[PDB]
């Protein structure tokens, strides 16, 4: 004891980078205050049995730890410190040790197999170190072990099959390591096991079919491994299971119908695997299921209509599969379903009438299916909608009567469908909407002026419709729009000068329209604009000087127009320009003396113009093909179609 206090003082004297504030300053007067005043020290019969120095800013190693001088230690917590070096084998000499914690340190090297001498150990904690090598098989001798936590280390090798001998183990935490080989089937003998977390390892092989004997496991986490084979049906015998995560593995075969026998399963994560076959009908009998994610697999066939029995279903992720047939009404019948992911599948038919029947659905994705028909009325009135994605389908109907008011809408994608009718001003009620994408529809009429009052809009895409009318100057009110795509419509009149005010604009496409008259002279106030496509319009007259004040331009296409006059010299201010397309115009006059001053241009086209004179000295001009440069009145100093 006095010898115990001296031994710990000698060890303390080896600590480096210590201050006077250290709580170990109380290690004084070894002869008379060891069991009463020393921080972290506690004794029985005047002999230390408990050393709890967690989070005491100790920097040092265990090389000179007084193993022999503290024979009666039973609780060692040295965690949350700056200990380095290895775990000496002499730690196995503490025959009375019950609790052993060296976690959250900078320990390196392997776990000494001498820990298997610690026959009284009930808790082993070595997490968040850099321990490498294999887990010693002799740890399987510690049959009083209740919990092993070795996670967040650099451990390799297989899980020892002796671990099946730990008949009292309740928690096994080995995640965030590099454990390999097959999971030993002897783990199925751990009848007291409650939590088995082997995730984020490099485990291979099959999930052992003996896991069906783990009747007390509530948490099985094995995700982010390299497991192969099939999910054994015996997994359905783990009746206590609450969370089952096998995602990001290389599992194959079908989902076993026995999973429907897991009456306590709330979370099931099987995503990012190679599962095939149909979803068994019995999956609907998981009455507790809250969060079902089997997305990113190769599942085929229809979704079972029994899914209407999952009355606690909140999240359903079936995206990126080969699911087919019509969507059954039960898939969306839960009153608490808030997320329904079905995109990237082969669903056909029309949306069921149950979609938002409880007014609580928030995210709905249907992208890249073969769905058709009208929007169900419960979806029209789904005021809780936040994200809705319909891209790449054949949905039909009047876009004005198909979608109600969506006060919580944030993102909606109607692209690549057959929606008809006119854009209603109801969208302005979506005061939180940041993106509205409706490309490739049969949308007609004008853009309602209320759209320009959606200052929160970041991205507006109405391209490839049959929208008509002239754009008002109130377009300037879209303060925060960065991607504006109105191309491929029948919009007419002059381009509004108010686009000047869209300071956040980065990508602007007004091409393939009926915009007439001169490009606005004032359009010089877009410092973030790197793309502007005005091609295939009825614009005419000189290219304005205002365009040349958009320094951040990288692509600029004014082709297929009726612009005339000379190309300005002032383009030199567009030093960040790379692609410049000016073909199919009536541009005339000589080439500017500059365009040597630019070094970023890589692509150009000036064909089918009345330009004359010599080509300048830049790569795109040297690298131009015949199509790039033909059609002009007097091309080059030496009448050349190609180099020099």
């Amino acid at each position: 004891t006095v010898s115990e206090a001296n031994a710990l003082l000698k060890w303390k004297s080896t600590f480096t980078n210590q201050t006077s504030s250290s709580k170990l300053s109380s290690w004084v007067n070894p002869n008379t205050s060891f069991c009463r005043s020393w921080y972290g020290v506690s004794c029985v019969r005047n002999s230390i049995i408990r050393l709890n120095l967690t989070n005491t800013d100790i920097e040092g190693t265990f090389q000179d730890f007084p193993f022999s001088a503290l024979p009666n230690l039973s609780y060692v917590d040295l965690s949350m410190n700056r200990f380095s070096g290895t775990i000496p084998p002499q730690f196995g000499d503490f025959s009375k040790l019950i609790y052993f914690d060296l976690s959250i340190n900078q320990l390196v090297g392997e776990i000494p197999s001498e820990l298997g001498k610690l026959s009284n150990l009930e808790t082993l904690h070595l997490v968040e170190n850099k321990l490498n090598g294999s887990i010693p098989s002799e740890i399987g001798r510690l049959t009083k072990l209740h919990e092993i936590a070795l996670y967040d280390n650099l451990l390799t090798g297989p899980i020892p099959s002796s671990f099946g001998n730990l008949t009292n183990l309740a928690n096994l935490y080995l995640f965030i390591n590099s454990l390999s080989g097959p999971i030993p089937p002897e783990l199925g003998n751990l009848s007291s096991l409650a939590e088995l977390c082997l995730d984020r390892n490099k485990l291979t092989g099959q999930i052992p079919s003996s896991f069906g004997k783990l009747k007390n496991v509530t948490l099985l986490n094995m995700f982010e491994n390299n497991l192969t084979g099939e999910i054994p049906p015996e997994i359905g015998d783990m009746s206590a299971l609450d969370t089952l995560s096998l995602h990001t593995n290389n599992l194959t075969g079908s989902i076993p119908s026995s999973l429907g026998n897991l009456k306590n399963l709330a979370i099931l994560h099987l995503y990012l695997n190679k599962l095939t076959g149909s979803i068994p009908e019995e999956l609907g009998d998981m009455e507790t299921m809250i969060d079902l994610e089997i997305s990113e697999n190769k599942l085929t066939g229809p979704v079972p209509g029994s899914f209407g029995k999952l009355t606690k279903l909140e999240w359903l992720f079936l995206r990126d599969n080969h699911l087919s047939g019509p969507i059954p009404p039960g898939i969306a019948n839960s009153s608490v379903l808030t997320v329904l992911q079905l995109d990237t599948n082969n669903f056909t038919g029309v949306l069921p009438e149950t979609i938002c029947r409880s007014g609580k659905l928030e995210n709905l994705t249907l992208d890249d299916n073969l769905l058709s028909g009208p929007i169900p009325i419960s979806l029209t009135n789904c005021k809780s909608l936040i994200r809705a994605r319909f891209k790449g389908n054949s949905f039909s109907g009047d876009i004005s009567e198909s979608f109600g008011e969506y006060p919580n809408l944030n993102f909606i994608d109607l692209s690549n469908n057959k929606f008809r009718g006119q854009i209603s001003p109801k969208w302005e009620k979506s005061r939180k909407l940041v993106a509205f994408i409706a490309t490739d529809n049969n949308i007609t009429g004008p853009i309602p002026p209320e759209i320009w009052n959606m200052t929160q809009l970041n991205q507006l895409d109405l391209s490839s419709n049959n929208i008509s009318g002239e754009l008002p100057e109130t377009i300037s009110k879209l303060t925060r729009v960065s991607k504006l795509q109105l191309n491929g419509n029948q919009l007419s009149g002059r381009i509004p000068s108010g686009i000047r005010s869209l300071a956040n604009l980065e990508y602007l496409d007004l091409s393939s329209n009926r915009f007439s008259f001169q490009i606005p002279a004032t359009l010089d106030s877009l410092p973030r604009l790197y793309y502007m496509n005005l091609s295939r319009n009825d614009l005419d007259q000189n290219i304005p000087m205002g365009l040349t004040k958009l320094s951040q331009l990288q692509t600029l296409d004014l082709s297929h127009n009726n612009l005339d006059g000379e190309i300005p010299s002032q383009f030199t201010s567009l030093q960040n320009l790379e692609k410049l397309y000016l073909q199919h115009n009536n541009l005339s006059g000589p080439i500017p003396s500059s365009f040597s001053e630019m070094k970023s241009l890589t692509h150009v086209d000036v064909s089918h113009n009345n330009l004359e004179g010599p080509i300048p000295d830049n790569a795109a001009f040297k690298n131009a093909r015949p199509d790039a440069l033909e059609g002009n009145r007097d091309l080059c100093g030496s009448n050349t179609t190609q180099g020099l």
Binding site: D101, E147, A149, Y173, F175, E195, C197, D199, N221
Partner: peptide, 5 residues
Amino acid sequence: ESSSS
């Protein structure tokens, strides 16, 4: 120390 994943 000793937390579920």
